[PDB]
Design a binder for this molecule. Sequence first.
Ligand code: HEM
Length: 412
Amino acid sequence: EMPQPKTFGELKNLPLLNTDKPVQALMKIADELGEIFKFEAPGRVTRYLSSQRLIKEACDESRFDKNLSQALKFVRDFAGDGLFTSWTHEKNWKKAHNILLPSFSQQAMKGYHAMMVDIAVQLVQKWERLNADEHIEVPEDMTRLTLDTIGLCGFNYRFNSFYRDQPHPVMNDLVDKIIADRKASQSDDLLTHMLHGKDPETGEPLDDENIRYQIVTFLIAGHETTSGLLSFTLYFLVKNPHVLQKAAEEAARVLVDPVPSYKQVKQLKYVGMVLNEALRLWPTAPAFSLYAKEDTVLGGEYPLEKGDEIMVLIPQLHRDKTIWGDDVEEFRPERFENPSAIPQHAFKPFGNGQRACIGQQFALHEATLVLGMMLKHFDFEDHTNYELDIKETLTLKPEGFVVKAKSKKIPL
Ligand code: HEM
């Protein structure tokens, strides 16, 4: 019989999620109940999976396909059948995937690099211009960077977040504007492919209504999880000075020019390890949902019926001691020295299979470029001895994380 947490009469397990930190609560429950537990609400049921041994089965695309969780069904009210909130069987999913994938590879990443540097330089200038004893609000500045970068690299649109105190402000006029601005403009960017690319399979381009949903989808998915990653990784860096020393040394040895080239970002191997170890501990889109395509038995013991939902709790997967060793709470980038050594389906911060994160290379190239520049240009201090406090929205972020940065005075 499947483990299940405490209940609340006819509300079953629902009130367990009446908390501003539901994924953290679910991790505690998984630590209590193990690799799988049932979670019941009035009218619905799901099973939360935490072990590599079960999650590797869940990731078998012949048996399970992406499900839209509760949260995603609400997000679909405004992101529609854009890539993130479409079902795999909806015609617009594979069509858009085919149209947009060439935008997110590599020839593409070289073409985005210069506009990424545009926004990263604005970040570094902001910090160079701080006076003595002022501090940095980390998640806030990371979000200014990530929003501006997806806006510029993807849509040639400047949110100008660094010119603002309060985050950028609606959605329709913005979308309307991004489109109008482009009609009136010559780019080769994400919005280019949205407007002119044809799916080689169907021969069709995206229609107007789905183009609007994709812009909404990318503006959101294109920045919040990346802000969270950069913020957690700066937190782990300031809590682990020897790691910061190694990363800062690599940045100094590698970034020998006033601004980084694409090739130099790729050479930041140890920065790439640090980012993956942050993704291990706090994967910023921490859960994804699947449904059973047909009746099937999980782990030889848990029969599922067609349409049964499962949730992958990624932070708990990333703490599976049978895979990672006993020291899973420790921050050790050396875990990622050779990505080949990581067992299949043990590390899934970008989801799974054909429904995996389309933006993974973009996010990693942005994050590595920016952290490299941060580490080249400043020494950082955890002046408040900050206590990790993780705020949950769609994503995860270290709320109130602040540091001081002292400039190495290296020309930019
Ligand atoms: C440039 C930044 C990013 C962009 C533009 C982006 C975009 C997207 C899109 C459009 C999808 C849906 C893909 C599809 O199903 O066809 C997706 C999926 C996903 N992304 Fe990203 N993403 C970005 C960064 C990130 C980061 C930093 C993380 C995690 C640390 C992340 C984690 C995920 C996960 C876990 C999924 C699968 C979600 C699910 O299965 O329901 N993404 N992303």
